[PDB]
Design a protein around this nucleic acid. Structure first.
Lengths: 106, 98, 79, 93, 93, 106, 79, 98
DNA sequence: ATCAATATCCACCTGCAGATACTACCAAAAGTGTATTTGGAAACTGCTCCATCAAAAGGCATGTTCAGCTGGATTCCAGCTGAACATGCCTTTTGATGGAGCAGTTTCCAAATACACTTTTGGTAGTATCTGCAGGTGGATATTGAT
DNA sequence: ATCAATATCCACCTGCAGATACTACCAAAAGTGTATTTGGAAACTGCTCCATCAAAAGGCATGTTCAGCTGGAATCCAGCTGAACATGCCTTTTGATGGAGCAGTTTCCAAATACACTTTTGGTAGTATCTGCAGGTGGATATTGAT
């Protein structure tokens, strides 16, 4: 008995996602393709942010991704920044940035 | 006697705090403020500690982003010193008080 | 009068993270005023969620739900 | 018992960064992210089905919702992974 | 069949201003208004029940929803009207 | 058979609101008092706006309420303006308002 | 060009309703550019709803739904 | 030869346009803009008359409110003349730019 | 202060687009009676974790002094932007015909749902032993600011 | 440029909170297999309304001239606000205690779903009349602006 995730070639839990869909009352019926497609998208996105966050972690000589690495990866990425424009990542801080006019001398 | 010029330490502080992620408001004082405000809405309330921390993380993130918009309003006015009218203009444009 | 627990140095520090170099003396009272309004709005909603659930304890989730309501989604506390 | 995407986020982490770990606070943020995107996508799908008097949410509604919710490049790629997983799943069992 | 709140709006208009008409475009705006408020209120009650792991949307979820959505006084009165209509309804064969 | 709207003493259709809650997938079940309460809330808000829009039409020497009037009623009212803070009323226009600094020096 | 069809007098009339008294000569091009980003965002979503319903005609509802998810609800055009 | 001073007619215009609700952009030119933009997302598209008008009410309501914010930014800077930087600052703070 | 040029307003008028009153048909909707299922309030209570007391401490707030340099006030003037025209390009109206295609309706089957079982698994409770890195330390290097 | 006070970088290192390794249990999740019900794609198409002309109308945009007045550059200086310093308080930390109250398991009926049958209604369509007010003309007078 293969898992539906297996059948789909996915890491994310297709059976869970199908279940959460039904429980959420989004519609009277949930087609079998719905959770597969959705689990794939979720997996792709967590892969996209973990790729960038792991990079920020290396650039800071670290082996463990912490919240600051997730914030750096997101705010430094035009699209993830937009997708999460109204989101606050706890303990993420902000991006180093000082307005030019504030710098000394000329 | 050694003394850094005005603005040098302020810049040092900016690089310092933009580099870290720790909360900037003292813990206990923030906790009493939350309990005071909640209390004025409903007596006998209890708070999970993580509820107090969720509130402090949201409050500081909101203020920092607010000061950024305020800094931009000051600069727009040929100033490097933020003032109340900068905070007020940033909130009006944000739609926090038409 | 706990709003005065939100000290001048705490406000300067928040401003520095926000990239601010110079602060007018009237900014500290303005900021306390702004913080207070922000907390009143979030706590009001968080507590409304508490009472609805018939609880006497405000949870992290109540706050997280109150925050999402205001368009201030927070990641990290079960939300 | 409370569910979490942790074990799955962790599997994906080792695919992209084999020698990198993740603190629990960060995992907590990742879990909030997956839940948030799940709801936003399912929500658009939901309204999309209603606007069209459909009572069923299929991969199609999920696809349009993804196009509606994600910015240019994340969408194009997400749509591929999704279509690719549906196609593969359909040719099995 | 295209449903609309137009008639019930017109009825409410006469109780408030018996000698005042309303334009079609204005009626369309009002209909948009009742739909919007219905969806915002229903949606919040929805989340309310879900958060508390409940299957049913009672008048209690509608009340909290109203408290969450409406500004001070509007809420005070909307609650009053609400409790009143459910009270009168319970007392009637 | 006396309608539920009549029983609860309302003009708004309680039956319609019930049917609408169910078909919107807001929850598996919908209590009996829910559509009553909700219908009454929708009614009250409709009265509140029509009353104010009516006054605005009066104050403009008109008997027919048009979009302009709904806008004036809404934007001149602190509570409704907030409630509809992110709503555009077609053909509503804006409130007459000139920043004082732009007025003739005199 | 079509974006150039949105004339200076129209942009002026718009600014007047916004209570604007003096207008810089560069505003007109700035505005056209802003109007265009706006419509592309809205139309993009409207069209996406058109294609989902398998239609070749953008309907008022399509636009209304597009505006609503962009946080710009519009009353008066159905729903 | 009569002649109104600079600012007098503009002020008169403000009062005239804040009283009315009519669209201020020409319809056909606007319609051409909309169809052209749509052509880039999907070819051979038709538009209901109400769709276009919906698009026009939303756009004008959006530009007008943005002009109010821009005006506040010009005034904050001690000017009575709006410039591109006033629009940019207003959009930046609104979350439409950065 | 006087006074000509214009804009603005108020009273009244009429044509007509749009609001309105009547009749009729009707399917979807709303109420009503009844048998069956069930969500979630009750009552009891295991047990997490919130409120609170305690003692030590040094991180960090408060308050002052001092003077660097920013903001606010002021003045000057180049030239941009507004007002007013003369011109004429093209938006707007509106009649009306084709015909795209939105929308209604009949079909019919792949796919969903409901039900019954078995097998798999992620979350948890109990223990136990690694390890990434926060934070202290010393000293070499780099930044800042007076001369 | 030189030179001295200070901050800043980082290699080195260790303490340990937090991450990780594992055996165990297990209710809920997840998959397999049927029989049963149906949502909505598919094809045909009527009729709504979108794209298109045609065409005098003339409204409204565009190019030009003139100069008023605003924006931006340059000056000055009173005093706000930053940097540094002393003093010492109150937050942070470590931690154990009582118990409020959040949450798990069980019992059970008030209220919801699922049907079936009858009845009431709101929306679609005509067909015909009614009217609020937009738009036009006057004459009054307020406003703007040169003198």
């Amino acid at each position: 008995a293969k898992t539906r995730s297996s059948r789909a070639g996915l890491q994310f839990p297709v059976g869970r996602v199908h279940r959460l869909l039904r429980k959420g009352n989004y519609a009277e019926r949930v087609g079998a393709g719905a959770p597969v497609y959705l689990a794939a998208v979720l997996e792709y996105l967590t892969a996209e942010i973990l790729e960038l966050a792991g990079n920020a972690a290396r650039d800071n000589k670290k082996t463990r991704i912490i919240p600051r690495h997730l914030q750096l990866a997101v705010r430094n990425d035009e699209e993830l920044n937009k997708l999460l424009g109204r989101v606050t990542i706890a303990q993420g801080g902000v991006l180093p940035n000082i307005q030019s006019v504030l710098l000394p001398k000329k | 006697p050694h003394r850094y010029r005005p603005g040098t330490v302020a810049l040092r502080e900016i690089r310092r705090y933009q580099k870290s992620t720790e909360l900037l408001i003292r813990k206990l004082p923030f906790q009493r403020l939350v309990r005071e405000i909640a209390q004025d809405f409903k007596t006998d309330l209890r708070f999970q500690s993580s509820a107090v921390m969720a509130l402090q993380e949201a409050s500081e993130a909101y203020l920092v982003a607010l000061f950024e918009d305020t800094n931009l309003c000051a600069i727009h006015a040929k100033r490097v010193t933020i003032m109340p009218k900068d905070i007020q203009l940033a909130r009006r444009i944000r739609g926090e008080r038409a | 009068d706990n709003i005065q627990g939100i000290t001048k140095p705490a406000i300067r520090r928040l401003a520095r993270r926000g990239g601010v170099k110079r602060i007018s003396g009237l900014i500290y009272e303005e900021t306390r005023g702004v913080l207070k309004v922000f907390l009143e709005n979030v706590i009001r909603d968080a507590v409304t969620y508490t009472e609805h659930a018939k609880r006497k304890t405000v949870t992290a989730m109540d706050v997280v739900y109150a925050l999402k309501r205001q368009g201030r989604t927070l990641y990290g506390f079960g939300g | 018992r409370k569910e979490s995407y942790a074990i799955y986020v962790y599997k994906v982490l080792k695919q992209v960064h084999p020698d990198t770990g993740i603190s629990s606070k960060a995992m907590s943020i990742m879990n909030s992210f997956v839940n948030d995107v799940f709801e936003r996508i399912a929500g658009e799908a939901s309204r999309l089905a209603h606007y069209n008097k459909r009572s069923t949410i299929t991969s199609r509604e999920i696809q349009t919702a993804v196009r509606l919710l994600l910015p240019g490049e994340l969408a194009k790629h997400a749509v591929s992974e999704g279509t690719k997983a549906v196609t593969k799943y359909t040719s099995a069992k």
